[PDB]
Amino acid sequence: HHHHHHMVHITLDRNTANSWLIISKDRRQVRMGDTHQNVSDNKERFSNYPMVLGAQRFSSGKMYWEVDVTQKEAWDLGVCRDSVQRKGQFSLSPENGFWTIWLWQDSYEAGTSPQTTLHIQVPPCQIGIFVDYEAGVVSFYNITDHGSLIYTFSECVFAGPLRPFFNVGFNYSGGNAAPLKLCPL
Numbered sequence: 354h355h356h357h358h359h360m361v362h363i364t365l366d367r368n369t370a371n372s373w374l375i376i377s378k379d380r381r382q383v384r385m386g387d388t389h390q391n392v393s394d395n396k397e398r399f400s401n402y403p404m405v406l407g408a409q410r411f412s413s414g415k416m417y418w419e420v421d422v423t424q425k426e427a428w429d430l431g432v433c434r435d436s437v438q439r440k441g442q443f444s445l446s447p448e449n450g451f452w453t454i455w456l457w458q459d460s461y462e463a464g465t466s467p468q469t470t471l472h473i474q475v476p477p478c479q480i481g482i483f484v485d486y487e488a489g490v491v492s493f494y495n496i497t498d499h500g501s502l503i504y505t506f507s508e509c510v511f512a513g514p515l516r517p518f519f520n521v522g523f524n525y526s527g528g529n530a531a532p533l534k535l536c537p538l
């Protein structure tokens with residue numbers, strides 16, 4: 354992939370975060386806190402899961418960014434509609450407005466309905482996310498393995514503005530405290 358030259362500077366939107374998340378001062382890192390983080394509730398916040406959106410909204414063009422997932426046991430990454438459900442239980446699927454991959458219990462899977470098994474030989478420490486709005490494409494790249502393709506969602510029906518999507522995952526095990534970090538360009 355030669356997608357690096359569509360690189361965009363992504364920052365996290367505090368106001369969308371689950372109330373247990375801690376976003377860094379530079380808005381480039383997020384991690385699970387050990388308690389509720391002393392913020393008011395609002396209609397933007399993901400209530401049931403440790404999720405947060407990027408501040409940027411995309412309705413055209415080609416966009417690329419990279420996320421560091423080093424030492425995490427569980428996470429979800431990708432893009433979603435600006436109008437996704439925030440409150441209650443829901444599944445990550447294109448029908449619900451999400452184009453995502455994840456790590457869960459040592460398996461990587463794409464957020465199709467039902468979910469698709471991914472085949473990754475080299476556990477990634479960084480993930481590249483490529484969106485082509487006009488083509489209807491969301492692609493995922495293994496930066497640790499020379500940029501090798503992980504998954505492509507094609508014929509996507511975005512049906513509105515897109516936002517970068519993140520889930521740091523729960524930390525019941527004590528092995529998933531590490532942050533998601535947006536990597537420098």
Ligand SMILES: Cc1nsc(N2CCCNCC2)n1
Pocket residue numbers: 371373400401402403523524525
């Ligand atoms: C609805 C919700 N968002 S975070 C959260 N935690 C309590 C459950 C134990 N793990 C810590 C995070 N619950």
